[PDB]
Write a protein that binds this ligand. Structure first.
Ligand code: MG
Ligand code: MG
Ligand code: MG
Ligand code: MG
Ligand code: MG
Ligand code: MG
Ligand code: MG
Ligand code: MG
Ligand code: MG
Ligand code: MG
Ligand code: MG
Ligand code: MG
Ligand code: MG
Ligand code: MG
Ligand code: MG
Ligand code: MG
Ligand code: MG
Ligand code: MG
Ligand code: MG
Ligand code: MG
Ligand code: MG
Ligand code: MG
Ligand code: MG
Ligand code: MG
Ligand code: MG
Ligand code: MG
Ligand code: MG
Ligand code: MG
Ligand code: MG
Ligand code: MG
Ligand code: MG
Lengths: 33, 122, 97, 88, 176, 127, 201, 46, 41
RNA sequence: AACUAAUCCUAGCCCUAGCCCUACACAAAUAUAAUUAUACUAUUAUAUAAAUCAAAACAUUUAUCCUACUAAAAGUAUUGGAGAAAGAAAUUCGUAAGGAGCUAUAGAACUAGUACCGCAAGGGAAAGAUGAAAGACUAAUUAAAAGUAAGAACAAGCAAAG
RNA sequence: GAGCUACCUAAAAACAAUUUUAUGAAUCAACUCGUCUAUGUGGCAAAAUAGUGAGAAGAUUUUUAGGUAGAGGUGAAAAGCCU
RNA sequence: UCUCCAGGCAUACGCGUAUAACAACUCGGAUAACCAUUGUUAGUUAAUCAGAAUAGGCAAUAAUCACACUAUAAAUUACCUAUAACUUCUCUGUUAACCCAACACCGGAAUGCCUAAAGGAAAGAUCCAAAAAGAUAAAAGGAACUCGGCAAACAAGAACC
């Protein structure tokens, strides 16, 4: 027997940079002060 | 080693296995394998004339929305049937037998569009 | 072995809550109440062991008597098998004859 | 237009041993599926004549070509004589 | 023509496109049946354009301009669909008194459960169909044990569910 | 229309009419190279090629000469965090060849086109 | 999902889908449940900070995360951070507001600025209104800009937007006819054939 | 000979041997389904 | 796990401190350290 | 002067008490090779539970299993290779939400009857851990396990003791 | 549980060249089988590889679907086979 | 471009997106390059290829180039009589280096066509020790080897229990 290969997923940016991603801009609900 | 979890479709199995993807039939298969399409079995899209139509997909944000009052049989009955019966009752020209006069249908048979069992699609 | 690296949150016991303060009241309801009620009537617990005590084999049989016919299929199967396990141990196995 | 793999054949209507190795005329009957009324219904009215043209080019090219290869002419020995046939 | 599958030529490439509010049910109720039939197709053509633009954005790996427009269109079509459903429902009740458009009945399946059965249209009566008579709407006695096991299984889940809520409130009261 | 019942038809029955249509379609840019007359659509799996012809000719008034359809298998290979297969929906692709010699080409939407000599010391200080 | 933790970032945003991924199993936050009726703080209501860094400073609510009993005040309870940090550039220093729980703030009486506790009670018209526990007084519901950014008064409809009057026109005439029948009569379709018998079962 | 390849896949054989219609044919097969439904199996039959 | 031994760390340290000056795994592994310590005693 | 690692608290669970239930939830599809809009070929549980095991073998027999109120009568009358064992009745008595339970190898198998294994019936897991706030850049705490590194070894030996 | 294997039912396939004859004949491929030796022995393989060999128009071999089930089935009996 | 090797292309069954492009360089290929891996986007188009009305009446005479020719194991809906209907194209299969053997396994895997025009690469670099495995050559002798001519041979013939 064996154990399964879970991929086991400052880190999100690398994750999406390697994979590539469509990051649509978001309208900030609260205006910045 | 067969996959028990994925859906059974016509792409799987031998050539002899075939089955539909949910499209409605439009014809009949006669003997000697001739397909005969029936014109009435093929849906017809009833599209109205939209020339001079004032309504567009979206509405003014300035337009006040209304209080929700979902339609009820009582509200339908009062709006349509009550005015006649009330006036007729005062006139005295009323009887149980002549409910068809006000729009009642004793049976749905013979109508093109039957309310139950429904015989027309949306 | 490995040990906690921080002290656990302090545990506070309030000794004068209603349950602790009034614990033991109406335990002489019999001698001080003309014996209308036995104190064992004041026990709260399973139906089959209020005012009663026994070893595990005795407790198993008594539960079956009281609620055996209202038990679930899986539980009654387990309860019945426990009786037979305990019967064979207490009556056939052990140091003393 | 769909691909298959099956026997490759060059035939004029008879085998090479047959003395009648040339072609005079072909008569073709178009199937009901391609007739004038159905095409007009499908809105491909401009294809009524196109159906005729395509059948002739394919039918006659095969028949005139097959005759040439009965005479020994192929792609690397191109025909010295134009090969002629007609069809209705 | 095929031009109707795309937005106005000026809007192409624009970062955002201004859209109004979606139709609410009450506003739609004012309109007549004939008007709603026309309004449906007005919404449908808008919906096809937005669905078309949504796919092209994915193909180009770009953000879809003003994606809220699609949501507003879908809501309006549901409201138009709802209002028409209400009108038919009331008319069905008045003339027939039936609560459902489709025939059905309550039946017990071969596994011992009670399930609503939706009827189908056939050209022959039920006693003559041989494909219908293979279907069984009864359970044999060997299902009785399995019927009890379901009830006991469900009782365990609900008892656990009640117990947990009681425990959770204890945590709240201690915390607050 | 989809997810609705069609009245069973028998000899001499009326015409089947759908007044409000539940079918929504999207026009897509071809993946491979297609003739200028051909147009691609993604359509609900319950739509037939006959439906698309009448759908386009009546709602959009587009003259159609031929329609071809295929069903594309969606991928079921990607797995979630629990190692459960994720399914991409299967869909139907329709190829429409325009009539009257008419031509169409997919439009191009989205046409949009301190001091090195004093390092590590804050400049704010004027001393 | 039982484990989704509500945060200052709006649900469904890029940050939220990273703060709350499907595999996260963080410890539940304990929230004293508050009835929809009981809750009395609204966006635009001036409130006072009972305790903390800015205790005694009145501010205006700008956001409410009801699942966390949070009220966020503009320009108060502020720590400092860098926005738009890049590899080449540091970013811009800004003051970022932090959530304050309901029990750490109180509503303010308008005429006399003080942290007056309020009670919910109806009016002559019947509309529910907040009333101050002491110095009984009507605290009006404030007006806050719409979250989507749409200001109806400034709004001017462009193409594809129905005009006001047209949307409000009444054309419905109640009658015992389905939408199907009305359209056929209006469009003049004629059908005299009738469906044969169908045995529903 | 080399063993381990006793499985020669065939969709006709599989659906006939362990399919929905086969399981419902006899009362014992119906109880196979009843057990799996009670256990909570995602796949009642092939 | 109603009752679990909570002092095992200090029980292990008692034997280990008498073995720290040995060579090999006898100086750090309780199962081997314990036997070596007794022979010294 | 540190790597591998370690620390953690609540997700839920457990036993009772109480209580009959009336959860059986859009459209559409499905008993056809289920989940395929319409004819074809029609549709239907089970005769007594057995054995292991006890009798130190085994062959009649062997509590519960195979339920009919509590306490007593009573392990009494009876029954039994009169062995192992089994075992009444007449009769009398009887008005009522909690935890000196578990806290991630524990408590349910359960984050799931999933992944995965098996032609099938069937078998069946593992794991998580910042803060008031991540719209504060996702933290800290620990000579602390075995294992290594920092730092190979230096005649001679149960490796230590004097 | 007969998708392996044993046997069976139904519907289908394959067999060149050469010599005999008119064939469970001959030489020898494809195909089926597994004689002898070496290698391998956690191996390429939970029975293989490389050579060498036996049959090769028949009681041949192969394909597809169906049948027989454990107190049993199948068996040109090896107490073989039945994942 | 060169050197060398010689089961390839289709269909059936099966598998189920491994197909193609791009971007990635963690995991997967027993290493790299590169991707068969990860993410994103695309794809397989059919009236011919492939799949999916009723009631009666009646049949002696194989196949094999079917003639001759014998043979033995004895061997494939039609045509008629009446009734009924009186112009039709929808639906589904179509990708790939693929399947069964826990694996990118020297194994297993049906048929048609063809035999190199199709398809491929035995060597990561170096070094030439022992022992081990395989191929080729052998002065003089020729079974003296060995349980036995096992294995090998420029042999493959003859006989007997
Ligand atoms: Mg097709
Ligand atoms: Mg196996
Ligand atoms: Mg096989
Ligand atoms: Mg015995
Ligand atoms: Mg016995
Ligand atoms: Mg556990
Ligand atoms: Mg467990
Ligand atoms: Mg250490
Ligand atoms: Mg010494
Ligand atoms: Mg078989
Ligand atoms: Mg031959
Ligand atoms: Mg022979
Ligand atoms: Mg031979
Ligand atoms: Mg021979
Ligand atoms: Mg045999
Ligand atoms: Mg023998
Ligand atoms: Mg076996
Ligand atoms: Mg590729
Ligand atoms: Mg690349
Ligand atoms: Mg890829
Ligand atoms: Mg065909
Ligand atoms: Mg292909
Ligand atoms: Mg390997
Ligand atoms: Mg080549
Ligand atoms: Mg190589
Ligand atoms: Mg080499
Ligand atoms: Mg040699
Ligand atoms: Mg020599
Ligand atoms: Mg010798
Ligand atoms: Mg000798
Ligand atoms: Mg030899």
């Amino acid at each position: 027997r064996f154990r399964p290969p879970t991929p086991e997923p400052k880190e999100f940016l690398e994750y999406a940079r390697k994979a590539g991603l469509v990051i649509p801009q978001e309208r900030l609900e609260r205006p910045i002060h | 080693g067969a996959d028990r979890m994925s859906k059974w479709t016509s792409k799987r199995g031998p050539r002899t296995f075939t089955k539909s993807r949910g499209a409605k039939k439009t014809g009949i298969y006669t003997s000697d394998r001739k397909f005969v399409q029936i014109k009435e079995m093929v849906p017809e899209f009833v599209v109205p004339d939209l020339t001079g139509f004032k309504l567009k997909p979206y509405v003014n944000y300035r337009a006040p929305a209304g209080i929700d009052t979902p339609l009820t049989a009582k509200a339908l009955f009062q709006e349509t049937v009550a005015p006649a019966i009330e006036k007729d009752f005062k006139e005295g020209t009323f009887d149980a037998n002549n409910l068809e006069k006000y729009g009642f249908e004793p049976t749905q048979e013979g109508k093109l569009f039957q309310l139950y069992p429904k015989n027309f699609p949306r | 072995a490995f040990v906690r690296l921080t002290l656990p949150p302090p545990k506070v016991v309030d000794r004068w809550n209603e349950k602790r303060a009034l614990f033991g009241v109406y335990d002489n309801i019999g001698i001080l109440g003309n014996f209308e009620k036995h104190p064992k009537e004041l026990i709260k617990g399973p139906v089959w062991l209020r005012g009663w005590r026994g070893n595990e084999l005795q407790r198993c049989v008594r539960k079956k008597k009281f609620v055996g016919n209202r038990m679930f299929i899986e539980d009654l199967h387990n309860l019945n098998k426990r009786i037979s396990y305990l019967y064979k141990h207490f009556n056939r196995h052990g140091k003393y004859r | 237009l769909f691909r298959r793999q099956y026997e490759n054949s060059i035939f004029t209507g008879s085998k090479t041993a047959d003395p009648c190795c040339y072609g005079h005329t072909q008569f073709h009957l178009i199937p009901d599926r391609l007739k004038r009324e159905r095409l007009i219904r499908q809105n491909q009215a401009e294809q009524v004549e196109a159906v005729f043209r395509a059948n002739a080019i394919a039918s006659l090219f095969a028949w005139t070509g097959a005759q040439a290869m009965y005479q020994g002419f192929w792609s690397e020995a191109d025909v010295t004589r134009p090969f002629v046939s007609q069809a209705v | 023509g095929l031009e109707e599958f795309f937005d106005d030529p000026k809007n192409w490439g624009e970062e955002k496109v201004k859209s109004g509010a979606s139709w609410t049910c009450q506003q739609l109720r004012n309109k007549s049946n004939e008007d709603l039939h026309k309004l449906w197709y007005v919404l449908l053509k808008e919906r096809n354009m937005l669905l078309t633009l949504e796919q092209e954005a994915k193909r180009q790996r770009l953000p879809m301009p003003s994606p809220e427009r699609l949501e507003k269109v879908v809501d309006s079509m549901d409201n138009v669909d709802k209002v028409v459903q209400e009108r038919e429902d009331a008319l069905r009740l008045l003339q027939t008194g039936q609560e459902k458009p489709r025939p059905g009945a309550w039946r017990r399946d071969i596994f011992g459960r009670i399930v609503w059965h939706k009827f189908k249209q056939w050209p022959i009566p039920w006693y003559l169909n041989k494909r219908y008579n293979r279907r069984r709407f009864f359970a044999m006695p060997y299902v009785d044990r399995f019927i009890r096991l379901r009830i006991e299984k469900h009782a365990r889940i609900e008892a656990r569910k009640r117990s947990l809520q009681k425990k959770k409130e204890k945590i709240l009261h201690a915390k607050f | 229309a989809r997810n609705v019942l069609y009245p069973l038809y028998q000899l001499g029955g009326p015409q089947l009419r759908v007044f409000r249509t539940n079918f929504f379609i999207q026009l897509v840019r071809p993946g491979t190279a297609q003739p200028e007359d051909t147009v691609q659509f993604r359509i609900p799996m319950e739509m037939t090629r006959v439906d698309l012809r009448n759908y386009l000719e009546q709602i959009y008034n587009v003259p159609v000469a031929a329609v071809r359809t295929r069903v594309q298998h969606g991928s079921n290979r990607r797995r979630d965090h629990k190692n459960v297969r994720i399914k991409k929906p299967d869909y139907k692709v329709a190829y429409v060849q325009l009539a009257h010699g008419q031509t169409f080409t997919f439009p191009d939407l989205f046409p949009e086109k301190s001091d090195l000599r004093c390092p590590g010391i804050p400049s704010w200080f004027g001393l | 999902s039982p484990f989704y933790r509500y945060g200052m970032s709006r649900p469904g945003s890029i940050a939220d889908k990273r703060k709350n991924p499907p595999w996260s199993r963080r410890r539940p936050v304990v929230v004293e449940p508050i009835s929809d009726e009981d809750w009395h703080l609204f966006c635009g209501d001036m409130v006072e900070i009972l305790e903390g860094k800015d205790a005694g400073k009145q501010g205006k609510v700008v956001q409410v995360v009801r699942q966390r009993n949070w009220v966020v005040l503009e320009g108060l309870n502020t720590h400092y951070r860098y926005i738009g940090r890049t590899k080449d550039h540091r970013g811009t220093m800004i003051a970022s507001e932090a959530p304050l729980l309901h029990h750490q703030v109180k509503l303010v009486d308008p005429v006399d600025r003080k942290p007056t506790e309020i009670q919910w009670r109806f009016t002559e018209a019947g509309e529910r209104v907040r009333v101050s526990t002491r110095s009984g007084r009507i605290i009006p519901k404030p007006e806050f800009p719409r979250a989507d950014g749409i200001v109806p008064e400034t709004w001017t409809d462009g193409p594809k937007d129905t005009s006001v009057e047209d949307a409000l026109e009444r054309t419905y005439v109640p009658r015992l006819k389905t939408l199907e029948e009305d359209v056929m009569e209006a469009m003049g379709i004629q059908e005299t054939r009738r469906f044969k018998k169908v045995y529903w079962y | 000979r080399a063993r381990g390849n006793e499985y020669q896949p065939s969709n006709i054989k599989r659906k006939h041997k362990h399919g929905w219609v086969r399981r419902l044919s006899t009362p014992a097969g119906v109880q196979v389904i009843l057990r799996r439904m009670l256990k909570g199996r995602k796949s009642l039959s092939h | 796990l109603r009752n679990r031994l909570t002092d095992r760390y200090w029980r292990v340290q008692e034997v280990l401190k008498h073995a720290q000056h040995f060579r090999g795994r006898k100086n750090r592994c309780y199962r081997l350290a314990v036997r070596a310590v007794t022979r010294a005693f």
